[PDB]
Amino acid sequence: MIKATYSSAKDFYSLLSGLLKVTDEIILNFTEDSIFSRYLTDDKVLMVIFKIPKEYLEDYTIDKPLGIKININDLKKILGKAKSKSATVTLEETEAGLKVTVRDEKTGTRSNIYIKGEKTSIDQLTEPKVNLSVTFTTDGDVLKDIARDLSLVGEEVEISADENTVTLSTEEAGRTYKSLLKQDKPLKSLNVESPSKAVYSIEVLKDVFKVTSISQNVTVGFGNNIPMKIEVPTDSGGQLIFWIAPRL
Amino acid sequence: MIKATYSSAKDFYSLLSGLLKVTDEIILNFTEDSIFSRYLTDDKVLMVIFKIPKEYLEDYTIDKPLGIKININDLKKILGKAKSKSATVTLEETEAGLKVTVRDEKTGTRSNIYIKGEKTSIDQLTEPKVNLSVTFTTDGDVLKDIARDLSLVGEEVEISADENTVTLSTEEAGRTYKSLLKQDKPLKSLNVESPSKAVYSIEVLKDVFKVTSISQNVTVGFGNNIPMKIEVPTDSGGQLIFWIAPRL
Amino acid sequence: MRVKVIDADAFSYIFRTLEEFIDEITLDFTSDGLKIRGIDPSRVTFIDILIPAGYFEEYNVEKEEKVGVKLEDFTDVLKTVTKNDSLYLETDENQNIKVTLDGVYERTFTFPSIVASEIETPNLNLEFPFKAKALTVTFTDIIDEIEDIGGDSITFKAEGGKLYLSANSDMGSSTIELSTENGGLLESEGGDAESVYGLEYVVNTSKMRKPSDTVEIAFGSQIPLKLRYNLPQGGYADFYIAPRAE
Amino acid sequence: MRVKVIDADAFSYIFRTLEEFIDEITLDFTSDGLKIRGIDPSRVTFIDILIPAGYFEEYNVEKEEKVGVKLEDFTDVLKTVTKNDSLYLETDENQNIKVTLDGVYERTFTFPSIVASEIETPNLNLEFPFKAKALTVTFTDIIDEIEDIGGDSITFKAEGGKLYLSANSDMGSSTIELSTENGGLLESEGGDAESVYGLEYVVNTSKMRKPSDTVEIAFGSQIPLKLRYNLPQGGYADFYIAPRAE
């Protein structure tokens, strides 16, 4: 059966806690190239993706692709029992569902839980296929700060960039907001293939941005009136990926 | 009008907290020789006396004897506001009732409260007049321990003493208790004018004894089938005095 | 005009204090410096603030320019300042005020201009019988402690050069002594005095802790309490609280 | 008979532990020492205690004397012992047990004698596949921690000379490793073994902390768990807990 080991219980938990508007049930997809879960909010504007490349999965045994629909809440309880920040996690398939084990060699302790879960066919990962004209990398704390700013003024965020500057703007009831992100302030990297501009929902961009704080190297990509992509990497491989539908 | 100063807010509070079955209202009697309050439980078995000799009252001005019926609860609230254990207390008569002030030079703070109180005629202090054949002194903690013991077994305590030993005994449902108090174990002093014996209610003796823990030098006196007298002195003069009616 | 503040963290608390008293403030930029003046709805408290040009690292005001702004929105963005944030105030010609926070990243908020009332000085001349100086931190701490105690009024009493603050509850009170003896006060002037003031009005000035180094306390019978929270570069924040606010 | 205990504080906890299992105990004083033997109502736990004469400072038992007593009352007076209290046990000829606490003041409690059942040994012969020794303090701590975790059962598993205690909750569990490596165990014997026992029964022996220096843990599949809490002077307190108490 399916069996996989992840090197960080803490990081795993951070990822799951980042699933915005996630219902009590999710579908963990076990594939050859990665374990992943992806759902699309009812409004169809935001696509939340949780993905762990096979490169960051040790002792990974898998006969054939399969997906297990489990209660995300139970999976959070067990990950919180992580005595240390060096605790690992193993995922083991079961006839009844999924067995999750957290191991902490440091304190010589362990914990497990048998989660009842329906077995189904893998939910294919359908990320938007577009050319990200603009990509930049920054610490999540900054984006969180920008989320706080946005939660003050506008209702729609207009993000746009030239060769050296990324600009976010909002306007509401006579009040105005406009932040500027540039290289080394605070962007760690900036790639502008061509001047681009798009508009996104503040409600959605705010929620997402706030979540990206769990990463120190968030990658944001977008282009002219195309969906924006946020990558929230962890130091152990586990990855959060968001897709925001632009306002046209 | 009447005005008196006591050197210990803490001790004053300990005394008031020792008033067993005391109703919300008490009568503070201001006399030439002492400030005091005395009430007798409904069952008429226990007489609780609170007394502060004039020797321990400084700056004590008094035109003529008078008693103020006040709410003891309010007087406890103010005494608890004692920032330090060196805080003093002043009692000042008012047209409306009684003004109580707690002063703590150590922290450079003060607190007061105007208590509404009916003015009446002094309730004369009528202590039982008998010859205490047996008197002994001991730390209140011991008596408290004995109270705990008694709260286990009997229903009536029989206290009796010869020239060198004080004995307490109870019996209930086949169970028996008998403690022995002697000089230096734990009695600090023992005076036995003549072999004596009396019986008292465990319910009452227990409650009283438990209270005497606030003193390190409790004086207990009794005789053949006569009321028992407990004196609970404080290091500042304030004194608690109990009278227990024996079972005849 | 265009003004720049370095320690914007402390600077923001000046306006967070004002939130306790007034809804709209009128930033009055003059050649001498930033003058701010307001009065609470109950008219119990009159506030007179002066932030001299020297207080700022950069101060560029050609002619006097008054710009009113809803304090809540202005303070909402001021709360978002960090320790290493520099602040910029400016006018976009449309009279609209511009707040530019510059730190980890640069950001500019803009607020619409609103009708600003003119506040007339309540007291022609005031002679204070007693006057004491103290550390703003020491004073505010005691003020916060008095808020915890609770009460409807605070009796300010001066006796022998010492200040006694009595948090007057109902039928009771708790007093705190301030003096050069216990380090509560730095110095004393004048003679004995005593009057009562509203507790909430005094307490609500506690958020002047950070910005203000020292605070001057002056009062007297039947006359307003003047709390002057001194500011760097000869600045100040005056709070006049009416007497007998039981 | 007449017996005297010095460290009566620890001594009392032996009987406070028993309260968790049985209501009435039968103090069986013999020439060799004090033998105590009981069995809980569920018959899951069998208790075999031996307190040799040497354990006591004074031990005077001419002929064997059994005296049963309601444990609650006996423990109610044992709880009242201090650090510097010496304890005395005796029989007033009326078969009634006498407890004399001697410290700050001298006091004697007396309990009526009651009908005492005879407890038959449940296991003729027991061969334990695995056996480990550990500090009673270290072990009890973990036991208390397992009680906090909660669960219906505790899986005792021995692997490679290490002991693994798994607090089996519902649909999940939390495991703690004990070994000579992490100081959890002092030593190990025998081979691998694994069986499950009732959580409450194991946990309720934690109050043996004070009296017992070291504890010997022995178990195996389908056989009882034997917790032997070693006592001074070659004494012991054995707890046999039945298997599969899910």
UniProtKB/Swiss-Prot annotation, chains A, B:
**Residue runs in coiled coils:** none
Annotated GO MF terms: DNA binding; DNA polymerase processivity factor activity
Note the InterPro entries from the entry.
Answer: DNA_clamp_sf (IPR046938), Pr_cel_nuc_antig (IPR000730), Pr_cel_nuc_antig_C (IPR022649), Pr_cel_nuc_antig_N (IPR022648)
Picking any one GO biological process from the record gives: leading strand elongation
Query: What superkingdom does the record give?
Result: Archaea
List UniProt keywords, sorted A-Z: DNA replication, DNA-binding
Pfam families linked to this entry: PCNA_C, PCNA_N
Record function comment = Sliding clamp subunit that acts as a moving platform for DNA processing. Responsible for tethering the catalytic subunit of DNA polymerase and other proteins to DNA during high-speed replication. Both trimeric complexes inhibit DNA ligase and both 3'-5' and 5'-3' activity of Hel308 (Hjm) helicase, but stimulate Hjc, the Holliday junction cleavage enzyme.
Q: Please report which protein family the annotation says this sequence is part of.
A: Belongs to the PCNA family.
Relate the assembly described in the record. Answer: The subunits circularize to form a toroid; DNA passes through its center. Replication factor C (RFC) is required to load the toroid on the DNA. Forms a dimeric complex with PCNA3 and trimeric complexes PCNA123 and PCNA323; does not form homotrimers. Crystal structures show a heterotetramer of 2 PCNA2 and 2 PCNA3, which would be large enough to clamp a Holliday junction.
The name on file for this protein is DNA polymerase sliding clamp 2
Question: Which organism is this entry from?
Answer: Sulfurisphaera tokodaii (strain DSM 16993 / JCM 10545 / NBRC 100140 / 7) (Sulfolobus tokodaii)
Q: What is the lineage of its organism?
A: Archaea, Thermoproteota, Thermoprotei, Sulfolobales, Sulfolobaceae
User: Which gene produces this protein?
Assistant: pcn2
UniProtKB/Swiss-Prot annotation, chains C, D:
UniProt cross-references to InterPro entries, sorted A to Z: DNA_clamp_sf, Pr_cel_nuc_antig, Pr_cel_nuc_antig_C, Pr_cel_nuc_antig_CS, Pr_cel_nuc_antig_N
Extract the SUPFAM superfamilies matched here: DNA clamp (SSF55979)
Molecular functions (GO terms): DNA binding; DNA polymerase processivity factor activity
Q: What keywords does the record list, in alphabetical order?
A: DNA replication, DNA-binding
One GO BP annotation here?
regulation of DNA replication
> What parts of the sequence cross the membrane?
none
* A Pfam family this chain is assigned to: PCNA_C
Task: Cite the NCBIfam families for this sequence.
Answer: PRK01115.1-3
Spell out the family assignment given in the record's similarity comment: Belongs to the PCNA family.
Query: What is known about what this protein does?
Result: Sliding clamp subunit that acts as a moving platform for DNA processing. Responsible for tethering the catalytic subunit of DNA polymerase and other proteins to DNA during high-speed replication. Both trimeric complexes inhibit DNA ligase and both 3'-5' and 5'-3' activity of Hel308 (Hjm) helicase, but stimulate Hjc, the Holliday junction cleavage enzyme.
Q: How does it assemble?
A: The subunits circularize to form a toroid; DNA passes through its center. Replication factor C (RFC) is required to load the toroid on the DNA. Forms dimeric complexes with PCNA1 and PCNA2, and trimeric complexes with PCNA123 and PCNA323; does not form homotrimers. Crystal structures show a heterotetramer of 2 PCNA2 and 2 PCNA3, which would be large enough to clamp a Holliday junction.
Q: Which PANTHER family match?
A: PROLIFERATING CELL NUCLEAR ANTIGEN (PTHR11352:SF0)
Protein's UniProt name? DNA polymerase sliding clamp 3
Native organism:
Sulfurisphaera tokodaii (strain DSM 16993 / JCM 10545 / NBRC 100140 / 7) (Sulfolobus tokodaii)
Q: Which gene encodes it?
A: pcn3
